[PDB]
Amino acid sequence: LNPESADLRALAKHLYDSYIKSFPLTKAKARAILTGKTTDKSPFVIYDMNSLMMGEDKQSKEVAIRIFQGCQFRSVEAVQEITEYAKSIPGFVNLDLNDQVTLLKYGVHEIIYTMLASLMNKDGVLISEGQGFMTREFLKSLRKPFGDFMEPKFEFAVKFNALELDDSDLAIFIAVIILSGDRPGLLNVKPIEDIQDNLLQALELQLKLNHPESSQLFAKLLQKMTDLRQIVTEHVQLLQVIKKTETDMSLHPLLQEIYKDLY
């Protein structure tokens, strides 16, 4: 380790410490729960309408709407965690405030789906800070148009989880996503790109130290960033459909804000 490398390690450690502060349920905690290598009670499993209702002891809309709205509420909380984490990224708060807003607006769902993968396996997803586990088959079964809204996320997650990143890798990756110079409408790209270049150097060093076995993990990881955007644009289209067919539904105001003029 030389001096520029050492600056890269300090950045990596700084981001990891903020990540743990900001995000209550880490991938490490999530993994223990899912394998059962944990000292906690195993989570309550929701595989049908009845288990969902019995689990609600651990409004009265139709179940598909309850579930979709539960997903919204989790994003609302995630946006808050991600915003706090973003503020800890060196140089982020010194950017033009409109640009900070634009980066968050475009970055949050990409981060949400990245981190949701930490909570997933091929059979289901942890919910409510790991107190629950909701089965993938149950989610597929919801009535249209809610029946397939999770499948692109599960599919992304099985591929992404094959990379076996840990929380220290993810902390940096998430920051790289937030500092994307190509977001529509940015006012001053150069200072964002300068920060992203350091973050990317830090990610690459991190991947080489923590995964010396896995050659070109860095390159594989960067290609996932393009897959994430597609998850998001497809999701926007499903929401357009949902808004048209269910006037029962109302979108949380934070989410309206984020989604407005997004793609």
């Binding site: 946006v79 808050q80 915003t83 503020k87 405030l97 900070q100 807003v101 968050l104 607006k105 105001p253 934070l254 804000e257 984020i258 407005k260």
Partner: peptide
């Protein structure tokens, strides 16, 4: 626009 996001950022 992005009133909540400003607020969360400026918080």
């Amino acid at each position: 626009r992005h009133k909540i996001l400003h607020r969360l950022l400026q918080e």
